[PDB]
């Protein structure tokens, strides 16, 4: 049955192939089924023969093409073929998808819409063709009226977004919007649907989902992706703390999320700016409820980029300062203590972050070290070489101390450098108070000396300055 069509196609088009096409009208289904059963190259040859012998200038071939399109759509998912044949079919269809009018492609769009909504799509590979169809619709100036092809595209995509998706098939849904030419509200509704889909997901599924959400965020749609991820993980960690009132898994997630957000802002020097602008509590100075452990962890994994580093580390500092100012006013006043519910402070946030940092959070510690030392250097006692001036500064250095303490307790690759930094700031200055550093050091050594048999030589060489150092400090 095939070799006749091969011989008809061997020489010329639409003079004998059409004539034979008007002989065999039905049975293309079973024909293609035995075709894929025996050999798929024959199916490809038939498809080439069909699309050359069924041009769409004449409208009879358009319906043969629509029938065989639906045939391939159903079989490629349901009928488990070989892989190479499937790829070939998809490539051929994506090739010949351009030679159509508006409404035929609109009804193919509605086919796929109803199918992904309700049709248990066995493999979903057919969706690869869909964005080609949306492209052909956008570009085809054969105007419709229900109106332009791009506007019917807007309609169909608004339909799809407002509609329900599959749990399994959101990956591929957003993978399609990956390569489309979209506008602001297009990409907005795409990400909003994929966003609200988060509440019906296993957690091993979220990382590549957010990866693709962000590479699509690259178009214009940056702010809302991060704001939603933030609110999601905020409520998540609150719910997990209330459960405590899969912790290791939850940590493992948050880490790879932040890793992929790092690559993102690495590639986009603006993403971090909106991130910052979204987060900065000092709009005037009042505490926003935007920040969180995970939020902060993201910031500290970010600060190891060369541009935002100092910006972030200033922000966090001033925010902690405000935290403590409002807190000391609260505890100072009954009247306000009557009104406001206690809010998870920045300090305690950081401490819990450190607790979570134990697992695999290597990217965070490098900034935590700097952060603690920065607090201490910034607000260390310098005046004697008052609560409003001193409590913040003291609590600040105290917090830096707690950070470095609980850090040094558990992290085995930033020791020697916590250590030598303390020693460096201690030894040379020899003028400004370092009692804070020293008491810190005392606590450190006391808790866990045996580690310092490994961290040895810095102290042996630190003794070399002992002949030059001042006496009282040497005694301590």
């Amino acid at each position: 049955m095939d070799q006749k069509i091969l011989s008809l196609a061997a020489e010329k088009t639409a003079d004998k192939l059409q004539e034979f096409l008007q002989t065999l009208r039905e049975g293309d289904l079973t024909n293609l089924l035995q075709n894929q059963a025996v050999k798929g190259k024959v199916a490809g040859a038939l498809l080439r023969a069909i699309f050359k012998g069924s041009p769409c200038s004449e409208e009879a071939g358009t319906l043969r093409r629509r029938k065989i399109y639906t045939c391939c759509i159903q079989l490629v998912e349901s009928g488990d073929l070989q892989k190479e044949i499937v790829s070939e079919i998809i490539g051929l269809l994506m090739l010949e998808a351009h030679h159509f009018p508006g409404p035929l492609l609109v009804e193919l769009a509605n086919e796929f819409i109803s199918a992904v909504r309700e049709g248990s799509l066995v493999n979903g590979k057919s969706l690869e063709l869909l964005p080609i169809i949306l492209t052909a619709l956008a570009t085809k100036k054969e105007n419709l009226a229900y109106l332009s092809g791009e506007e019917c595209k807007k309609q169909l995509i608004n339909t799809l977004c407002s509609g329900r998706w599959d749990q399994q098939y959101v990956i591929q849904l957003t993978s399609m919007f990956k390569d489309v030419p979209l506008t602001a509200e297009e990409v907005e509704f795409v990400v909003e649907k994929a966003l609200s889909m988060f509440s019906k997901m296993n957690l091993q599924e979220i990382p590549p989902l957010v990866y693709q959400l962000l590479v699509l965020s690259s178009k214009g749609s940056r702010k809302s992706v991060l704001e939603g991820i933030i609110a999601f993980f905020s409520a998540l960690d609150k719910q997990h703390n209330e459960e405590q009132s899969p912790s290791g898994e939850l940590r493992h997630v948050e880490g790879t999320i932040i890793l992929h957000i790092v690559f993102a802002i690495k590639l986009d020097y603006e993403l971090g700016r909106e991130l910052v602008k979204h987060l900065k509590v000092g709009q005037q100075g009042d505490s926003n409820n935007n920040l969180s452990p995970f939020s902060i962890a993201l910031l500290l994994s970010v600060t190891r980029i060369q541009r935002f580093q100092d910006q972030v580390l200033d922000l966090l500092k001033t925010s902690v300062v405000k935290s403590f100012k409002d807190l000391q006013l609260l505890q100072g006043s009954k009247f306000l203590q009557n009104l406001v519910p206690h809010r998870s402070y920045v300090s305690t946030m950081i401490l819990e972050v450190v607790k979570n940092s134990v697992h695999s959070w290597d990217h965070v510690t490098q900034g935590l070290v700097e952060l603690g030392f920065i607090l201490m250097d910034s607000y260390g006692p310098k005046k004697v070489l008052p609560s409003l001036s001193r409590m913040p500064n003291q609590h600040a250095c105290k917090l830096g101390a707690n950070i470095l303490l609980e850090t040094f307790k558990i992290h085995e690759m930033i020791r020697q450098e916590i250590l030598e930094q303390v020693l460096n700031r201690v030894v040379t200055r020899a003028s400004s108070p370092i009692s804070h550093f020293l008491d810190l050091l005392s606590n450190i050594v006391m808790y866990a000396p045996l580690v310092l048999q490994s961290c040895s030589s810095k102290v042996t060489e630190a003794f070399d300055y002992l002949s030059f150092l001042p006496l009282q400090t040497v005694q301590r």
Binding site: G248, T256, S360, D362, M413, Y447, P449, L450
Partner: protein
Amino acid sequence: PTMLPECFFLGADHVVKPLGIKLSRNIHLWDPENSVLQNLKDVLEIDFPARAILEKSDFTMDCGICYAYQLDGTIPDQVCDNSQCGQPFHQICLYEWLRGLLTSRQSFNIIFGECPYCSKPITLKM
């Protein structure tokens, strides 16, 4: 010799964890006048399995990757941070396995990845 020798543990991130925590808060109680074993029994606050099974294979102490003991003299030391697995592994076999794996992300000198038996987070420091 009775002075504190330099030491560390090999094993699990939940068994080795509180062992060092006791040691940190009892090393100050190290009385070098006693025997070392006697000092340990109170510093660590435990008794040893004093040859309690020594060299008798109950299949407990085995790599699970190479299924061997003393792989090139290398001991099953790396374990799972899991009550249910507690599957101990070598260094080299666990390294080479978590080498090809896609999820296996590499920090400075760390490889993270899933325990082969239980698919739980396991950390390897080279």
